[PDB]
Nucleic acid binder design. Structure first.
Ligand SMILES: Nc1ccn([C@H]2C[C@H](O)[C@@H](COP(=O)(O)OP(=O)(O)OP(=O)(O)O)O2)c(=O)n1
Ligand SMILES: [Ca+2]
Ligand SMILES: [Ca+2]
Length: 343
DNA sequence: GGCACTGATCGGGCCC
DNA sequence: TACGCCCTGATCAGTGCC
């Protein structure tokens, strides 16, 4: 198998540069503002100029503004980045036997037949793909070329930005012989530090570690994964991916326990959730983030589909029950998720 | 015990 | 210190049932 992983450098920020080229070459920060205050919100992404100054994704806006006061701080415009993504994935689809859009930001392309098994022509094709995306969309990306999904991802993320990582089948075993656990996709930090500390620094340290004592720490799934992965027996095929849930989340104007206050926001969240869902959900979940950013959720799955008018009533009840089991804390953010969807 | 099903938690930008 | 919006599957806990 010959897999080409595609990963769009500093995506949101870079789209903001394509739309406003005055922003290029200077620190730019793409923020999600909640509307509580002028600065309340979070860093979605930043160009590398801003990252040099210490701006990191996930960080509060005000905190980025401490270390990078002169950066350009722009609000996130997800619909546009979505459109950009769509067009780019469409470009990719024409090159692959199969494409797996892992998300708005990245995708895997099985090019095996396309390049007729010739891995080198696979690399060349990857160059053509980078070139084409650059020509048409003015977006730079990083590419991984490898004999599987995971390796392609790993060599990609090790090559950012604007990179072209390659792991020829010749080199695979050597790459696995010297690969840290924290460098594996799907292994946490809570999980990484355990393995790392409690014996298993690198991947090969799994081939010789009584399977069970590993299964204790990771679980059956992850242990099986890491095992076949280390054994060079991971092969997972490229599969078209199907959305399983849609959620909409709102920051309330002010913290409160009063359902009567939260409800119109919860309804609003329900409305554009349903407005965007592609089917009927069998399960509705209410998500409430508390003052201290603790997350409570209460959901209900039905034997049938849930209409929107019904969702209002169900969700109100679920919310009322969340605030029966907490009794003390105020809600800061309200959210709703539609799951188990019938297309 | 073990099936079939519901339900809560979780991590990080996606993955098993 | 500071603090958004959004999405998976695994895993474990509970219930009812044969
Ligand atoms: N806390 C985060 C992290 C990431 N993203 C979004 C913005 C990123 O552009 C996109 C892609 O994730 P990446 O890990 O690949 O980060 P970059 O694109 O910015 O590089 O996901 C986000 O909204 N919030
Ligand atoms: Ca990515
Ligand atoms: Ca990216």
């Amino acid at each position: 198998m010959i897999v080409i992983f595609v990963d769009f450098d500093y995506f949101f920020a870079q789209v903001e540069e394509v739309l406003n080229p005055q922003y290029k070459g200077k620190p730019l920060v793409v923020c999600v503002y909640s509307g509580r205050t002028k600065t309340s919100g979070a860093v979605a992404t930043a160009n590398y100029e801003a990252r040099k100054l210490g701006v990191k994704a996930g960080m509060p806006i005000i905190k980025a503004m401490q270390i990078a006061p002169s950066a350009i701080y722009v609000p996130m415009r997800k619909p546009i980045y979505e459109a950009f993504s769509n067009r780019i994935m469409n470009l990719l689809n024409k090159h692959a036997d199969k494409i797996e859009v892992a998300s708005i930001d990245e995708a895997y392309l099985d090019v095996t037949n396309k390049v007729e098994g010739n891995f080198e022509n696979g690399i060349e094709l990857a160059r053509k793909i980078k070139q084409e995306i650059l020509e048409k969309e003015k977006i730079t990306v990083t590419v991984g070329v490898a004999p599987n999904k995971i390796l392609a991802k790993i060599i990609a993320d090790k090559s950012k930005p604007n990179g072209l990582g390659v792991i020829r089948p010749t080199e695979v075993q050597d790459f696995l012989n010297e690969l840290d656990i924290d460098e594996i996709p799907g292994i946490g930090s809570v999980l990484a530090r355990r393995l790392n500390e409690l014996g298993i620094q690198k991947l090969r340290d799994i081939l010789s570690k009584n399977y069970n004592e590993l299964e204790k720490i990771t679980g059956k799934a992850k242990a099986l994964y890491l095992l076949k992965l280390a054994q060079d027996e991971y092969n997972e095929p490229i599969r078209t991916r199907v959305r399983k849930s849609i959620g909409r989340y709102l920051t309330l104007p002010y913290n409160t326990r009063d359902v009567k206050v939260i409800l119109p926001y919860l309804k609003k969240a329900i409305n554009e959730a349903y407005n965007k869902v592609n089917g009927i959900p069998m399960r509705i979940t209410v998500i409430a983030i508390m003052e201290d950013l603790d997350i409570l959720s209460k959901g209900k799955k039905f034997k049938h589909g849930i209409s929107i008018d019904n969702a209002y009533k169900v969700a109100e009840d679920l919310l009322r029950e969340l605030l029966v089991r907490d009794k003390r804390r105020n809600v800061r953010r309200i959210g709703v998720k539609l799951d188990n969807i019938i297309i």
